[PDB]
Amino acid sequence: PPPVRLFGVEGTYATALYQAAAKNSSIDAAFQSLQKVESTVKKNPKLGHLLLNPALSLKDRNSVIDAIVETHKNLDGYVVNLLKVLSENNRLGCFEKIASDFGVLNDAHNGLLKGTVTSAEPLDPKSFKRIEKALSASKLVGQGKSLKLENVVKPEIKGGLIVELGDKTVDLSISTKIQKLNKVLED
């Protein structure tokens, strides 16, 4: 069955959407259209993200969908059937969640991998490139797959780096090393 099994809270919806669009072949189109309706939802920030709140009727939810595919009509029909499904199933509290999940499945299908370089400060571009190079060089990025390596700032990790991707991490930070050191000097 289609790659990557993400069991989620309505991530079964995403899985279904994914598998459904694989059998329709056009996943990229679907993903793009899903991005567009997500974008116009996001760009209807008040009084359209506040209509993701559960208080609307079944009939009113249905009319919210009809208005949504009206709202900037020209959307794939598979995501309009999905929109209907989510409304009918009266869940839309994981709508952008489903979108994000469909993206993960899609870009997994595409082959793209994500990494992370947590630090307490933005690191050199030389560092960004060097790590991207290193990972690409190693089997860690298997190739036939790409790495969008993202440095993030979290002061939680004071100094160093932690490289993350594929649930494989290497953490050389001052905080973690300090922890182990402290413990050994508390022994």
Partner: peptide
């Protein structure tokens, strides 16, 4: 590295 830094500093 950090091991050396602490080691050095403390000692």
């Amino acid at each position: 590295n950090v091991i050396q830094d602490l080691y050095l500093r403390e000692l």
